[PDB]
Amino acid sequence: MILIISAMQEESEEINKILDNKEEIVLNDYLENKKIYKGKILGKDVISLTTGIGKVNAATWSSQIISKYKITHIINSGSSGGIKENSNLKILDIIVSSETAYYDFDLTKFGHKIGQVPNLPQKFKADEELLKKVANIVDNKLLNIDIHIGLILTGDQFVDNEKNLETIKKNFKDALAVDMEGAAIAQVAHIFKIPFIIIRSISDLPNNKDNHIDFNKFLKTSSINSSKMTKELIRLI
Amino acid sequence: MILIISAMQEESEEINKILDNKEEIVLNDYLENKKIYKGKILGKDVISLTTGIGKVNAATWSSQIISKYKITHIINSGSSGGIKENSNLKILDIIVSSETAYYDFDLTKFGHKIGQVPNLPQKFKADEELLKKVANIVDNKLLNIDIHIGLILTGDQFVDNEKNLETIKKNFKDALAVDMEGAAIAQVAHIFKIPFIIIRSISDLPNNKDNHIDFNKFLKTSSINSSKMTKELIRLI
Ligand SMILES: Nc1ncnc2[nH]cnc12
Ligand SMILES: Nc1ncnc2[nH]cnc12
Contact B18, B29 (CB under 8 A): no
Quote the CA–CA distance of A63 and A54 in Å, as a whole number. 14
Quote the CA–CA distance of B36 and B26 in Å, as a whole number. 7
What Cα–Cα distance (Å) separates residue B45 from each residue in B9, B41, B135, B145? Answer: 21, 7, 23, 26
Measuring CA to CA, which residue among B187, B167, B173 is closest to residue B123? B187
Contact A59, A184 (CB under 8 A): yes
User: Helices (DSSP H) in A17-87: which residue ranges?
Assistant: 55-68
Cβ of B226 closer than 6 Å to ligand 2, yes or no, is no
Beta bridge partners of B150: B97
Helix-helix angle A128-139:A211-236, to 10 degrees: 100
| Residue A157: DSSP 8-state | B
| Residue A235: DSSP 8-state | H
Find which of B27, B60, B73, B114 to mutate to test the A interface (most A CBs within 10 Å of its CB): B60
| Residue A108: DSSP 8-state | G
- Residue of A203, A205, A226 to test ligand 1 pocket, by largest number of atoms within 8 Å of CB: A203
Quote the CA–CA distance of A151 and A176 in Å, as a whole number. 5
Nearest residue CA, atom 5 of ligand 1? A179
Q: Can you tell me whether residue B224 is helix, strand or coil?
A: helix
Contact B56 A160 (CB under 8 A): no
Instruction: Give the position, in ligand 2's atom list, of the atom nearest the Cα of B157.
Output: 4
Contact B177, B152 (CB under 8 A): yes
Phi, psi torsion values for B205, nearest 5 degrees: -125, 110
CA B158 to ligand 2 centroid distance, Å:
5
Measuring CA to CA, which residue among B117, B179, B123 is closest to residue A58? B117
| Residue A92: DSSP 8-state | T
Q: What is the Cα Rg of chain A in Å?
A: 17
Resolution in A: 1.7
List residues of A with catalytic annotation: 11, 204
How would you class B224 by CB atoms within 10 Å of its CB: exposed for 0-12, middle for 13-18, buried for 19 or more? Answer: middle
Phi, psi torsion values for B149, nearest 5 degrees: -115, 125
Tell me the one-letter amino acid at A99: E
Measuring CA to CA, which residue among B84, B187, B80, B97 is closest to residue B151? B97
Quote the CA–CA distance of A228 and A108 in Å, as a whole number. 39
CA B210 to ligand 2 centroid distance, Å:
12
DSSP B114-141: TTPPTTS-SSEEPPHHHHHHHHHHHHTT
Instruction: Give the position, in ligand 2's atom list, of the atom nearest the Cα of B160.
Output: 1
Q: Supply angle C-alpha B93, B97, B99, rounded to 5.
A: 150
Q: Are strands B73-82 and A124-125 parallel, antiparallel or unpaired?
A: unpaired
Contact A38, A84 (CB under 8 A): no
Contact A194, A62 (CB under 8 A): no
Contact A211, A157 (CB under 8 A): no
Alpha carbon of B162: minimum distance to chain A alpha carbons (Å): 11
Does the domain made of A2-237 have the CATH classification 3.30.300.30? no
